[PDB]
């Protein structure tokens, strides 16, 4: 696979909120 | 490169003061050295 | 006798009045808590 992106550099993952309906 | 790292002059010479315990040996399966004990 | 043309001064410009010579044990013993540091560098002639 090609990377095609920057080699991370301190990955800050995303906070996702899941609301129930 | 400017890095935040504390340092102390002791006597006539200047030395880093490191307690590298939080960056490494936190949440891992290897025991920290320098705790050898005595008899 | 205060004879000089260019003498040994500190970084600010005040001339020193002599040299004190000992061994490093007593150097560290006076340096730790007895006497205070005035400066680290000094001005010295070249001839």
């Amino acid at each position: 696979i090609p990377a095609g992106i920057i080699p991370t550099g301190n990955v800050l993952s995303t906070i996702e909120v899941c609301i129930f309906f | 490169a400017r890095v935040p790292a504390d340092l102390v002059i002791v006597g006539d010479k200047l030395v880093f003061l490191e307690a590298l315990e939080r960056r490494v040996y936190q949440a891992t399966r290897v025991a920290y050295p320098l705790i050898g004990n005595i008899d | 006798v205060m004879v000089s043309r260019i003498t040994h001064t500190n970084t600010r410009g005040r001339q020193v009045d002599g040299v004190l010579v000992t061994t490093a044990t007593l150097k560290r013993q006076l340096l730790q808590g007895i006497l205070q540091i005035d400066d680290t560098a000094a001005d010295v002639p070249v001839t």
Binding site: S13, I15, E16, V17, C18, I19, F20, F21 | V24, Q26, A27, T28, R29, V30 | -
Partner: protein, 42 residues
């Protein structure tokens, strides 16, 4: 003001207009175990 108080640093205030209709919410975190890389091929 709550923000200019020194206690405000312990909270991360954020707006949410559609909160009165919230029944329920979850959030997730995926912090992983950090490992050392010991020399021997074990």
């Amino acid at each position: 003001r709550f923000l200019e108080l020194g206690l405000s640093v312990a909270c991360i205030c954020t707006k949410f207009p559609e909160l009165a209709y919230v029944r329920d919410g979850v959030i997730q975190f995926e912090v992983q175990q950090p490992m050392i890389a010991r020399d021997g091929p074990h």
